[PDB]
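[User] I wish I could look at a protein chain and see how it folds. I have put the entry right below:
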Amino acid sequence: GGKGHVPEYFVRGDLQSFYG
């Protein structure tokens, strides 16, 4: 949803953000 390093859920393809 933003920036960081651990992803926005366990999906990828057009995700470039992260959380905890």
Q: What stands out?
A: Residues 9 and 18 are 8 Å apart (CA to CA). The chain is about 0% helix and 0% strand. The two ends are 12 Å apart (CA to CA).
